[PDB]
Amino acid sequence: TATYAQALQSVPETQVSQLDNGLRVASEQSSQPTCTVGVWIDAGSRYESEKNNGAGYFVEHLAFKGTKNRPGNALEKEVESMGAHLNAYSTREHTAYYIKALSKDLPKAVELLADIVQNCSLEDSQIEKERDVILQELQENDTSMRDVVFNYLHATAFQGTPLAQSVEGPSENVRKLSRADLTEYLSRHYKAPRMVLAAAGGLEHRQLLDLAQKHFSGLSGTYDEDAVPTLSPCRFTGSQICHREDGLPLAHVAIAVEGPGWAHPDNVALQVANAIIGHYDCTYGGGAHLSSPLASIAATNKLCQSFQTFNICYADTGLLGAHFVCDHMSIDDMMFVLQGQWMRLCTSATESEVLRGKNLLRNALVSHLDGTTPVCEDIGRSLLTYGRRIPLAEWESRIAEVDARVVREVCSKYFYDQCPAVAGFGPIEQLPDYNRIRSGMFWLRF
Amino acid sequence: VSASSRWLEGIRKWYYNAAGFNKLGLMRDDTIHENDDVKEAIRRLPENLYNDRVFRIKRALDLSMRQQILPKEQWTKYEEDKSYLEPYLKEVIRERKEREEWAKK
């Protein structure tokens, strides 16, 4: 037989190599016919100024529209013809372009990625057509109360800083972003030591390095004289934003305190505590018997349609908290029960529930790195945030260190008597006053 | 097992008639005090047993108002008293003790 611990040793080591220009090449070999390969760039809206805040998202709309070598839909035909899938996303700190394809097609997939990230032909006719597309997407995003309330949370929490900005940018920016703004963005951020060619699947690390020196050696690894971008720390601000709109049928509320960031060891204990509080949906089967007090109370008393805890990490900062959706006469009870659990874990965390959170996180970690694409993302993103791939055996060590005392100490450090950031949208007349919310962050009995 | 068993059962039948709830047409389980375990068990009763429980209690309260009892023919016989609620209540208690044992670890 084999144990859980022994299975963690059987995970293949993630090989890492760096080209002469600074491009980092990482891979985890498996025994699969398919693979996922892509380029993870350390670029996002936090690097963008107020003028060009919508450029990276605009570039995402143009990355797959043509290049100097494969103009028009020529790239689109090659990917579709070999049955591969091309995808991309942008966040406030990371941009990614990746291809899912047969393992035999890895040489062509790498070639296309290099062609996209270097020789993107941002034709003026295409820039104008993607202008109206993005504006229409902004209208669509307005109808998602979840996406709205989380952008509001960033807007007030990091007010006055780059992280307050949205990824897509404002409506006005999309109607005056020029081709020079986009090329200046690309030539300033798409440098080799900030990119990571990650892959995962059936492939030898040798061939990925060969394709890297073959198709990425032609990349500028020499930064400007003093134009190296450096991320300034982003001031967190205890504040509140309330978009009252009673025409909507359910209220959305997002509350959070300041987290430490990606590389802080305290994230492991914070994620255990969020696992104890967990999440809920009105379609869950557990209901009254759920372990989380917030979840069982919400199910039995119908306090909400859903809630989720989160720990959003950035460079040296983050948003630690929860978000929920409920009827207009339930916002106060959900806030009360939510904060009560934060204070309870700060002061009275028990051992058995902490073993629960550790077990949930172990299952969440292993179940997420299940497939070539999630593993490829964990490779590329980890090399940007941590500068290395953290093996699962290391995560298990950090989780096992956590006991009830660690959760009480770590949670008190970030939750207890701290000013939260609140974001409300919808029928939020019953949303408690900020002072009352702030008073919910400590216990007079403690 | 008649000698010693029937004397104990004989004293129980004595007490049953002395308690006198049978004189109002009630059964033993109709007289139990409603705590949270008992409200759940009553909730779990099937339609017929619930409706029978309601009318017997209603008939007894009507008698208690009038300071009367039923004729002796209509008294609840000790041997015919059905503990219709006990099996539901036993399960409700068993479930609560399981929760409590999980709350200890």
Partner: protein, 34 residues
């Protein structure tokens, strides 16, 4: 969480042609959990 997959609270709006691709169904499945 409850799932409905068929591709092989006001939800949101789909307006442009780019955001419609992938929506056309392509044999329904229903999944429930805890």
């Amino acid at each position: 969480r409850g799932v409905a997959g068929a591709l092989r609270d006001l939800k949101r709006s789909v307006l442009c042609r780019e955001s419609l691709r992938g929506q056309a169904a392509g044999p329904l499945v229903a999944s429930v959990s805890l």
